[PDB]
Design a protein around this ligand. Sequence first.
Ligand SMILES: Nc1ncnc2c1ncn2[C@@H]1O[C@H](COP(=O)(O)OP(=O)(O)OC[C@H]2O[C@@H](O)[C@H](O)[C@@H]2O)[C@@H](O)[C@H]1O
Length: 172
Amino acid sequence: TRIHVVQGDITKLAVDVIVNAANPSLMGGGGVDGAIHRAAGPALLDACLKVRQQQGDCPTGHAVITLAGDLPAKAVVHTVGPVWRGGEQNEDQLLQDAYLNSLRLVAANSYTSVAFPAISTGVAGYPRAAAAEIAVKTVSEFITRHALPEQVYFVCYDEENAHLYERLLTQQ
Ligand SMILES: Nc1ncnc2c1ncn2[C@@H]1O[C@H](COP(=O)(O)OP(=O)(O)OC[C@H]2O[C@@H](O)[C@H](O)[C@@H]2O)[C@@H](O)[C@H]1O
C-alpha cells in the first residue's frame, strides 16, 4: 500500500521528491544524474553549486537536498551511492546508508512521497540483485518505523529490474 514499483523514467514522476544517484562532486554526470539535470534545467546546477560551495564534496553514503527546477517534483535529493569493488569494501553498508539518509532528508523536509532509482547498479557496477535486496529491505524496515515518508516509489528503467523488485517486495 505504501511501497510501489513503477517502470519508466524517474524525471516524469509527479512526487514530492525525486532521488538522484549522484557522485561526490554533485555536479552532474550521466545515467539518472544526467537525465535529472537535463529535465530540471539550469536551476538545479546553480543549486548544486551553492551546496558544494557550502559543504564541499558530498561523502559517499550521504545525501543532500535541493530545489527541483523544471521537474514535476518539489525537490531533488542527491545521494551518493557506493562504487562497487567486489563486496569487501563495506559497500553493502554504504548503499544502505545512501537509502537511509535519503529517506531521513525527505522526512526532515516534511515531504510525503519519494521516488528512487536503482542506486549504484549502472556505471558504479553494483550487482543488480544484491542491490535490490538492500534497497527493498532498507526502505521497508524504515517506513515500518516511520510515518514519513508516507509513500515510496521504486523507479526501474527496464522490465527485468522491475520484476526483480516486484518479487523481492512480495517476498516479505
Ligand atoms: N531515467 C532513469 N530513470 C530511472 N532509472 C534509471 C534512469 N537511468 C538509469 N537508471 C537506472 O539507475 C541505476 C543507476 O545507474 P546510473 O544512473 O549509472 O548511476 P549509478 O550506477 O548509481 O552510478 C553511481 C556512481 O556512478 C557515478 O554516477 C557516480 O560517480 C556514482 O558513484 C541503473 O540500475 C539504471 O537502470
